[PDB]
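Deviation from plan, reported transparently: magnesium ion complex.
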Amino acid sequence: PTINQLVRKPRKSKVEKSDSPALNKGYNSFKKTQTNVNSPQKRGVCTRVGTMTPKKPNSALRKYARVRLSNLIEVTAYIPGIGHNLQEHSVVLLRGGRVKDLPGVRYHIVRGALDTAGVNDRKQSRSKYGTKRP
Amino acid sequence: VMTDPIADFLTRIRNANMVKHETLEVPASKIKRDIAEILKREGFIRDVEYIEDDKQGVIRVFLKYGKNEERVITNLKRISKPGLRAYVKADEVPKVLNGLGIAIISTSEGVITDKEARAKNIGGEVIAYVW
RNA sequence: GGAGGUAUGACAA
RNA sequence: GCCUAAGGUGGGAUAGAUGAUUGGGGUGAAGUCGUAACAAGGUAGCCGUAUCGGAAGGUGCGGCUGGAUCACCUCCU
RNA sequence: CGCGGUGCAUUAGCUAGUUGGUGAGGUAACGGCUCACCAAGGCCACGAUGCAUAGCCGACCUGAGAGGGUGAUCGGCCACACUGGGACUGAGACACGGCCCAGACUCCUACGGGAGGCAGCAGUAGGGAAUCUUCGGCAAUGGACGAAAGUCUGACCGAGCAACGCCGCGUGAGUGAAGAAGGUUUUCGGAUCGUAAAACUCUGUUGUUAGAGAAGAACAAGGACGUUAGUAACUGAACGUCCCCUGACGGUAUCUAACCAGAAAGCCACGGCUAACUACGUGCCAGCAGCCGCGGUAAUACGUAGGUGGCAAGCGUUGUCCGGAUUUAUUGGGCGUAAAGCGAGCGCAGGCGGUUUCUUAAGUCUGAUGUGAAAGCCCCCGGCUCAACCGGGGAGGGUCAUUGGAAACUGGGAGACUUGAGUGCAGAAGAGGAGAGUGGAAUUCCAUGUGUAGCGGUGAAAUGCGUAGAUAUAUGGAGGAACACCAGUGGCGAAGGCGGCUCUCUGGUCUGUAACUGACGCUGAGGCUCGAAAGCGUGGGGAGCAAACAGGAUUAGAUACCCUGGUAGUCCACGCCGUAAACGAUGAGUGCUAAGUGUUGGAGGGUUUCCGCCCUUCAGUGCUGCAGCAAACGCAUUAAGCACUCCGCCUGGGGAGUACGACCGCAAGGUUGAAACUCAAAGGAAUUGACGGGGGCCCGCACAAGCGGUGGAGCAUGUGGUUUAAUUCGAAGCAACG
Ligand SMILES: [K+]
Ligand SMILES: [K+]
Ligand SMILES: [K+]
Ligand SMILES: [K+]
Ligand SMILES: [K+]
Ligand SMILES: [K+]
Ligand SMILES: [K+]
Ligand SMILES: [K+]
Ligand SMILES: [K+]
Ligand SMILES: [K+]
Ligand SMILES: [K+]
Ligand SMILES: [K+]
Ligand SMILES: [K+]
Ligand SMILES: [K+]
Ligand SMILES: [K+]
Ligand SMILES: [K+]
Ligand SMILES: [K+]
Ligand SMILES: [K+]
Ligand SMILES: [Mg+2]
Ligand SMILES: [Mg+2]
Ligand SMILES: [Mg+2]
Ligand SMILES: [Mg+2]
Ligand SMILES: [Mg+2]
Ligand SMILES: [Mg+2]
Ligand SMILES: [Mg+2]
Ligand SMILES: [Mg+2]
Ligand SMILES: [Mg+2]
Ligand SMILES: [Mg+2]
Ligand SMILES: [Mg+2]
Ligand SMILES: [Mg+2]
Ligand SMILES: [Mg+2]
Ligand SMILES: [Mg+2]
Ligand SMILES: [Mg+2]
Ligand SMILES: [Mg+2]
Ligand SMILES: [Mg+2]
Ligand SMILES: [Mg+2]
Ligand SMILES: [Mg+2]
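Because the crystal trials were delayed, the predicted structure below was used instead.
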């Protein structure tokens, strides 16, 4: 563009968006509205715990939880590690992070937090998966 | 239409220099004569002669080439433009290729080189870079 | 030589 | 007595939620129907428009070459 | 009061005490601040109004910088104190811990009526991923009151809690084996963990035990004297000098001595990016993953172990911001084919603009002064044992103001100029446009002779037409549409487009000349005009052609391609529509930068008896081709080269040119134009292959030309299938099956 054009219509940049939008919104019970609060995690209740299938290259029975968050948003989350003690109506803590296999899964469940148990038998990378030192 | 006769003068030199023409002619103006004189005494062109005509005069420039016809002028860039005038303060006066080139600056003391401008401790409108 | 015009076919490997 | 918060009534404006039902869209390791495009893709393709057809698409009109092949004159090396 | 710091027009209209005036009143004060009158203005595409969001700043994070992000703690300003309104008191409040009223909420009543407001310090409940003790003291500093002692001060000094952050120090040091045991792993030799451990000699930062003990205090008050001013004299006031007087922290820092290495390390990573590799276990499972991707029975990528790497009282994960991202490019990108030139013009505003004299000096440059608080980064300099941290002295920071200068450049003013641009004069060519006529060829139909069984059509056919006389042929008549030859990368036009001929009206361009004007120019958002074909409306026309449609074929099916028909439409008038691979897929203007060769319209000169040839030149139109440019293809004076001006437009693919809103349209639709969500690609050019119901050139019992067979019969044999206790296993298109 010419300088006069940039004066008339200045440069404008693409707006970025979150990879984990459900963590960006709080909820106000009084006003019954959604607040814009960036939160590293969020507590939710497991409405459904089950297994899911991956996309074409991969094949497994990935373990998820359909979690309704404290901010009223309904999200699909992944249960990392081997074996878990989650059930429906359990209270789980969600962190950000996609799972490339699962198209609709944008959050991971934090192990060792709230009702989520640490991973049995884990001995390496224990801080992930939430297991105490043996 | 022509909106920047200075840029036209610099481009005529650049294009003639590219094909190693011996000489070049341009419609005359005071600023063009000022620029031609600076190129003359800074050793970028061989000579400059002026022709009195009926319209505005003509300035003839004699381009300079070294042994093996190496080009003394590498390129010329217009800095201040009709669309965006460029002004530098005395402490903002540019150095072109760390002093191996020159910047032609218009000041209230006249049209001078970047060396002269920061000697006098003055700024002005930056006309062109020459290296 | 060059140029404008006038039926169907798993998946991975 | 004037001003006046709140409250009441009235008709509009505006924002979200929700609603029988409805629309196209995206997704989904191995469904049905055809084979429209890519070679001249077996009717060259595409563009706009109109019209018709289960469906891709077909057909008309104008346009484009981002056109395969053989056959011409101009041009030019 | 000037200036400065958010988003949205898919927000353009807003305003009526509103704008101004005249008086009056009111205020500390000017003022529509209020009012009564008289006018009607004010604001706004330089973004009014509306909507959404937000306390602002010093500063903080990031970045090479330009910038981007943020506005905790500390300081300044502002605003608010249960929600709304009001005034009182006062120098000051419309007043967090004041009043009044109203409201919602909690609480007390004897039911008549009363009370209350932690966004003060703690603390509780609730919300949340998530933030502290219902602590000591007023000693210090500051604040209120008092003459003062002093009282009050959840300011503030301290202490407590949390690795929440930053900084410092540890968890030992030295010697110590061809290298113990054990772990892991082996090619069983040895490797490796490893000088690591052990052992021996040391150390006490720390820790424990005892002891020693700060600064932070200056004071005030009071007790002594003294000096000034004043006074008759005083007490006292102001000041000066001595004595006296006070520690929350707290027995805290700190120091000293003794004693023991004794109590004091983890976390993540190790396929590539990316520093660090092997074993088992598991076998598309379980799981990993930031991206690419790992896992399908021999996985450095999953889980464990041994090693190893990085960092270390932390380490990792998630969230958020800047960077890398030139990925909005002012610094610092693009638009022929990758995303991107509006279909084209005409033009308001705006942006930009030829030469020159004088002048001005708004921009620009420069000097001085003022100011840009302190703290902070930075720079010196000191203090804490170092550092963090603290203190002192600077510097920096403004598109700041005031004032003095400069004057080239941009701008303003007064002149001058002729090259750009235009006018005049003289010429040139043209399917440029509009209107009204008109010509021949051909098709169809119609009439009439001649004439006889076909005609028409396809790959092959049939439908169809014809003995109610076809087609063909001859002579005529009617009507519509299109204009053979000329005709040409030829011409004209802004583009779309314009092709018989004649006339009328009409636009533009090109070439000379240099009489005239004297920069009058270029571009041009918004607006306006034009805009192929199809389509739409009204009224005409209708030969040929032909969506639709009918019939005949083809075919597995054919709602196609083919055939025979055929309506709209194609044509005209008028009014709509406003889109096209509206393309050179290349916006417009200007200047500059090798050559060669065609051609259209001019001009000039040198020859030629003319005709014409030769050369120079202007404006088009092509081809070839340097320099340069380009990812390549290619472009190349008709640039995609080198430059300046203005406009349009682009920012991964899909969802979408979709939805919603708006404008336009009779309608069809057009113009404007997202998001959720999803993918890690989409894409351009070129390369090597393979392939083609592409082309060219060849070969082989490949076909053709022949001879004899197989497929039919019986039987032999192999195979499939079936059967079986078993009918052993292998081979399966050519290339398994005597
Ligand atoms: K087709
Ligand atoms: K065209
Ligand atoms: K007044
Ligand atoms: K605020
Ligand atoms: K308030
Ligand atoms: K008070
Ligand atoms: K005090
Ligand atoms: K008290
Ligand atoms: K004191
Ligand atoms: K890895
Ligand atoms: K730029
Ligand atoms: K165009
Ligand atoms: K000036
Ligand atoms: K004419
Ligand atoms: K019509
Ligand atoms: K030519
Ligand atoms: K996207
Ligand atoms: K067989
Ligand atoms: Mg891992
Ligand atoms: Mg096909
Ligand atoms: Mg086809
Ligand atoms: Mg094709
Ligand atoms: Mg059809
Ligand atoms: Mg940068
Ligand atoms: Mg209070
Ligand atoms: Mg000690
Ligand atoms: Mg490596
Ligand atoms: Mg691993
Ligand atoms: Mg950037
Ligand atoms: Mg394309
Ligand atoms: Mg494109
Ligand atoms: Mg039409
Ligand atoms: Mg278009
Ligand atoms: Mg030419
Ligand atoms: Mg044969
Ligand atoms: Mg037989
Ligand atoms: Mg086998």
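Chain B is about 25% helix and 30% strand. We consider this an acceptable substitute for the interim report.
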